[PDB]
Structures are given as C-alpha cells and as structure tokens.
A paper describes a structure:
Beta-arrestins (βarrs) are key regulators and transducers of G-protein coupled receptor signaling; however, little is known of how βarrs communicate with their downstream effectors. Using cryo-electron microscopy, we elucidate how βarr1 recruits and activates the non-receptor tyrosine kinase [name], the first identified signaling partner of βarrs. βarr1 engages [name] [name] through two distinct sites, each employing a different recognition mechanism: a polyproline motif in the N-domain and a non-proline-based interaction in the central crest region. At both sites βarr1 interacts with the aromatic surface of [name], disrupting the autoinhibited conformation of [name] and directly triggering its allosteric activation.
The [name]–βarr1-N complex was formed with V2Rpp and Fab30 but without Nb32, as Nb32 hinders complex formation due to the steric clashes with [name]. The cryo-EM map showed [name] bound to the distal part of the N-terminal domain of βarr1. Whereas [name]–βarr1-CC has a clearly resolved density for [name], in [name]–βarr1-N, the density for [name] is weaker (local resolution is 4.2–4.6 Å) since [name] binds to a flexible loop of βarr1, the 87FPPAPEDK94 motif. We used molecular dynamics flexible fitting (MDFF) constrained by the position of the disulfide bond between βarr1 and [name] to place the main chain of the [name] domain. The proline region of the βarr1-N site (P88, P89, P91) appears to interact with the aromatic surface of [name], similarly to the βarr1-CC site. However, the weak density for [name] in the [name]–βarr1-N complex prevents confident identification of the specific [name] residues involved in βarr1 binding. We also observed conformational changes in βarr1 within the [name]–βarr1-N complex in proximity to the interaction interface. Specifically, the 45PEYLKER51 loop shifts by ~6–8 Å toward [name] and adopts a distinct conformation compared to that seen in the [name]–βarr1-CC complex and other active βarr1 structures. Furthermore, the 87FPPAPEDK94 motif is shifted by 4 Å toward [name], although it remains unclear whether this change is due to disulfide cross-linking or [name] binding.
Residue numbers in the entry:
A (entry chain H): 5 to 120
B (entry chain B): 85 to 113, 116 to 141
C (entry chain V): 355 to 365
D (entry chain A): 6 to 63, 75 to 187, 195 to 330, 343 to 356
E (entry chain L): 3 to 108
The structure:
C-alpha cells in the first residue's frame, strides 16, 4: 500500500550510517525492493537492489565497495547499511518497490530521507 | 493454338487425372489451369503455379 | 558455423 | 507491434514468430503461426520443411512431431490468419510463404528440472522446438548450415473464478481441522493455515509441523512420483492433555532456500534463465491420457506429534496478464 | 548504456502537444518506463512499458518506440502536469535514468 523510510543520518566524512525502509501492504517475496538516490539538483541515480525471492543483490559501481543491502522478512523492511563519503553526503535516498515477476519498473515510492 | 496440361489427382477429384499432351487444347493454359476430358465435352481444372507444365 | 542470436523487427 | 525473428547461418532462409509464449486455454490451445522468407535462386530440387517438435530430455524422446511444407505451397490448404500471416506477408511481399501448427489439447506444459552440481548442456524437462530447414527430401540428413532452430514454450495462467475453499479434518479422540485462505495462490502470496486442535486424551501435542510440498508426477519415468518440501514452518506449540488450541500460521515458498535441492521442477526456460517453481498443471476433466511429460501439483501438510496429519491441496500459478 | 534525454522545454497553460524523447545509446527491446516528479515529492510511475499506460494515469499520456528511439507525448497539458519527467530502461542490470526534462509554464 505504502512505503515509509525511517532512516536518516548526519555523518562526518568517512564513517558509517544505516537506512531502514518499512513497507506495509505487500509481501517481500512478491515484490522487489530498490534504493534510488537523488543528489541535490541532479538526476535519480540507481543504488543497491534486492530480490528476496531469488536471494541475490545488485550494487551500483560507486557503492559496490562500501554499501550493503539487506531485507528483513519478518516485518517487510529493507536495510541499507552505508559507509558514505563526501560525494554522497548531500543526497536524498528513496525506497521504491517493483513487481517481482515480469516487471522491473518502480510503481510505489517512499517520501525519501536525506543523508548528510 | 498452344496449350499444355499434366496429369494430377491430388485435389479436385471431380474432373482431373486426364492424360497429358492431348491434341484437344487445355481449357486454360498461370496460377490455375483447366483442361478437357479424355473423350467427352467436360472440362477439368487444377492449380498450376508450382512449376511450368510439361506437355 | 554456429547459429546467430535471435533478433527482432518492426511490423 | 514487434515480432521476433531468427536466421540460419549462410543467410539463406529466415523464420518469423510473433511470440514464444503460447497460452494453453483449458478448452483450446493457441496456434503457432510463422512466416518463412526464402530466396529460391536455384532451388530446383530443394523444398522447405518446417517442423514442430515436443521432446522430453534426460538422449531425448518425443511424442508429438509434425511437418509442414511451405514452398512450393500445397494446393487446397488452409487460409493464413490475419493476426500475423497477413501483416508479415505484406511486409515481405515477394517470397513470404507461411506455415502453421496446431497443438493437441492434452500435451504437457513446459516444465524444467533443477540440474544441481552437474550440467548436460540443457537441463531435464519438456521443451517445444521449431525447426525450419530446406532440403531435397524430408527423410534425408540436413546439417546446421541449412536449419533454423527456435525454442518456444507453452504456459497457462490462473482460472478467473476461484474454487471451493480448501479444508480437511481428521480425528475420546483428538480432532484437528485445517483451512487455507483461498483455493488459488500466486507465486509470492503467503499461504496462511488455520489450525484448531481440541484434545480429550491424556497425550499432549508436543510440536506442530507445517510444510508446503510440491508433487511432480512423471508418467514416462514408470509413473514415478517425486515430492519435495518447498516451505518449512516450526513454531513449537504445545497444548495441555485435554485443552483447546486455535491459531493462524503463515508460509511462503521461494527458490532461494530450495536451490540446494535437486530434481525440483521449475518453469520453462528459454536459455539458462532463472525461473520460479513450476506452476500447477490443469488437466481437462481428469482425462489422464497424457503420457509424455510431467504434471505438477502442490499440497500443504499439517502434522502433530504427541509425546496424525492432514493435507490441504491448492494451486500455485500466475494470474492472467 | 547511456540513456540520453532532450533538455527542458517550455509549454502553455492551454493544452497542446508536447513530445519528449529519450535516445538510447544501445538497443533495448521496448523496456522503457517514464516517470513524473513534482518538486519536493517522490516520482510517480506513468508508463508500464513503451506505449502502455499505468493504472490511474489519465488517458492523455502516451508513449511510442521507433527502433532505439522512445517518445513521451501529452495530448493536452492542463496546469497539473507541470513537473519533471525521467526516462528509465530496465533491460540491463545497471539501471540508468535520463537527465530529466523539466516542463515549465509560459
């Protein structure tokens, strides 16, 4: 029905952070959870995505070395641990959902929590 | 005149399978061809777009 | 000789 | 609108197909309409044969093969359908010579097994292959340079109207009654089980075990039946010697945990794809005359162990797009 | 795969034809989706797939594909469609979005 991201942070360059994304309305095996990142005034850059039905995760090139995505099947939430730096210290991270079977376009979106 | 016909009886069994190269010119010498019977004033037809007739 | 990749065309 | 196509090496003939996903309606299967473009420069003693092969692999064995001669076209034949074989012929208005096939209503769907640690080029299962080749005669050998081979699959979706609500109960004996949410479930839906165990004996229930099991009957393998548990639930709930327990549970089958298991059925794969668990097979009126492939069915199990079990059947398939 | 989009475009309050194109550098088999993001809010999915609408989207919005060229069209621009639109392809794992075209009122 809707997605709510309860994460947020204010990190000195070169530390750690953690993002959570609660989802109410749909199961986590019938949907795929993605994280989309929008720098201020720039386009939507794609970040880690997870397909819990298959179990594998994709990563962006700029985040492959530091970010780590996970999902909690007990409460339909997605976790995005971060080790952000200066270049990622201004963006707003969304949490959007796509159909697991025979689709990859994102239909439901969260409000987005800024990370700095 | 000039006309050609060949023996064939795969389809349209009502009037076909006559002898080929008869003196009586075929009723229609292209995609479809027609020809007369062996000894009567009856005309039979069969498609002929597969290959040029040999008669 | 091996088979070529399945393509697609307009209609 | 887009249409799929493929060509042979040496570029002599090309095969067009509008889709490689043919829906199998419970009353009539969809037809296969294809158009072949060929250039008979010197094809004096050459003919075009298009074939549709349904094969079961392990070496392979087939129970439905067919042959259609496209050029020179057979006289007194059927009319091509306007959906594909008119627009395609309009586009290739020079040598487009079409072909068509019809599938019997009782052929098995395309279901592939999970190979595991060993690969044999293509995994075990049932697949439909469309092979078009030019040759002097049908019975003579033909090599890869002259043949086009394209793989298709047959699928079927969920019924529009749901069936009766599943329920099964068995037996101063104890009485257990179970029920599911509905008759038809999708591939990501959670399967909830309602449980009630009223007790009158002195033997207390120690542990409640619930699992979702996939049944795959293989008729060609001497009518062998292989079952595997695709879901596992363990809540360790106990009840007093003579008490009354009622509860709701939740299960969800998925492939991530079941990747370890071998010989488990999966949906049709075009080429080394990742697919969900094999959908249920809908048999028309129970006329089990099909002796070619594999049929898949799912049944939930609920078991109690004292210091008895019930099985609830259901269907697992995608909804109609 | 670099997906390129046309720059920002002006418009009028009264409805008029507006075409926005997204030029794919590599061929994608009609796997392209279009979004709409108003300032300060999350993007809204508009197109299921090229020339296929989504549940709840009005009938004005339309799409098309010409080989590797995709297009987003609006039959009539009422003052509510004044936002920014993104073109996304979901064929290959490194999913990319277009630079985004911002529609504005004149």
């Amino acid at each position: 029905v809707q997605l709510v991201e309860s994460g947020g942070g204010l990190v000195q360059p070169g530390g750690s952070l953690r993002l959570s994304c609660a989802a109410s309305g749909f199961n986590v095996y019938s949907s795929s959870i993605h994280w989309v990142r929008q720098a201020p005034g720039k386009g939507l850059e794609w970040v880690a995505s997870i397909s819990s039905y298959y179990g594998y995760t994709y990563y962006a090139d700029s985040v492959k070395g530091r970010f780590t995505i996970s999902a909690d099947t007990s409460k339909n939430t997605a976790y995005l641990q971060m080790n952000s730096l200066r270049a990622e210290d201004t963006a707003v991270y969304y949490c959007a959902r796509s159909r697991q079977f025979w689709y990859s376009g994102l239909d439901y979106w969260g409000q987005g929590t800024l990370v700095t | 005149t000039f006309v050609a016909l060949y023996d064939y009886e795969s389809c349209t069994e009502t009037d076909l399978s006559f002898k080929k190269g008869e003196r009586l010119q075929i009723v229609n010498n292209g995609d479809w061809w027609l020809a007369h019977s062996l000894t009567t004033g009856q005309t039979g037809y069969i498609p002929s777009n597969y290959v040029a007739p040999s008669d | 000789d091996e088979s070529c990749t399945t393509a697609s065309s307009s209609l | 609108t887009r249409v799929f196509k493929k060509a042979s090496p040496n570029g002599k003939l090309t095969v067009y197909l509008g889709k490689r996903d043919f829906v199998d309606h419970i009353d009539l299967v969809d037809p296969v309409d294809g158009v072949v473009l060929v250039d008979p420069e010197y094809l004096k003693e050459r003919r075009v044969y298009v074939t549709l092969t349904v094969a079961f692999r392990y070496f392979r064995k087939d129970l439905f093969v067919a042959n259609v001669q496209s050029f020179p076209p057979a006289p007194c034949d059927k009319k091509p359908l306007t959906r594909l074989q008119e627009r395609l012929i309009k586009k290739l208005g020079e040598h487009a010579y079409p072909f068509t096939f019809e599938i019997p209503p009782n052929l098995p769907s395309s279901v592939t097994l999970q190979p595991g640690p060993e690969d044999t080029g293509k995994a075990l299962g049932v697949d439909y292959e469309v092979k078009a080749f030019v040759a002097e005669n049908l019975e003579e050998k033909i090599h890869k340079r002259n043949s086009v081979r394209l793989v298709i699959r047959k699928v079927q979706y969920a019924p529009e109207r749901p069936g009766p609500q599943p329920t099964a109960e068995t037996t101063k004996p104890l009485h257990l009654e179970a029920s599911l949410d509905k008759e038809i479930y999708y591939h990501g839906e959670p399967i909830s089980v309602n449980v009630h165990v009223t007790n009158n004996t002195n033997k207390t229930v120690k542990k409640i075990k619930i699992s979702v099991r996939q049944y795959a009957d293989i008729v060609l393998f001497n009518t062998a039946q292989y079952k595997v548990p695709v879901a596992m639930e363990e809540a360790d709930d106990t009840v007093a010697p003579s008490s009354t327990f009622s509860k709701v549970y939740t299960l969800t089958p998925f492939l991530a945990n079941n990747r370890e298991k071998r010989g488990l059925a999966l949906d049709g794969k075009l080429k080394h794809e990742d697919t969900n668990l094999a959908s249920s097979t809908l048999l028309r009126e129970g006329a089990n005359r099909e002796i070619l492939g594999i049929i898949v069915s799912y049944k939930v199990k609920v078991k109690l162990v004292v210091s008895v079990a019930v099985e609830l059947p259901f269907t697992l398939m995608h909804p109609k797009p | 795969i670099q997906m390129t989009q046309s720059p920002s475009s002006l418009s009028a309050s009264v409805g008029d034809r507006v075409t926005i194109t997204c030029r794919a550098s590599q061929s994608v088999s009609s796997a392209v989706a279009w979004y709409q993001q108003k300032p300060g809010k999350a993007p809204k999915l508009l197109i299921y797939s090229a020339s296929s609408l989504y549940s709840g989207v009005p009938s004005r919005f339309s799409g098309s594909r010409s080989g590797t060229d995709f297009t987003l069209t609006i039959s009539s621009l009422q003052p509510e469609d004044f936002a920014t639109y993104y073109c996304q392809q979901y064929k290959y794992v490194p999913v990319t979005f277009g630079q985004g075209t911002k529609v504005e009122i004149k």
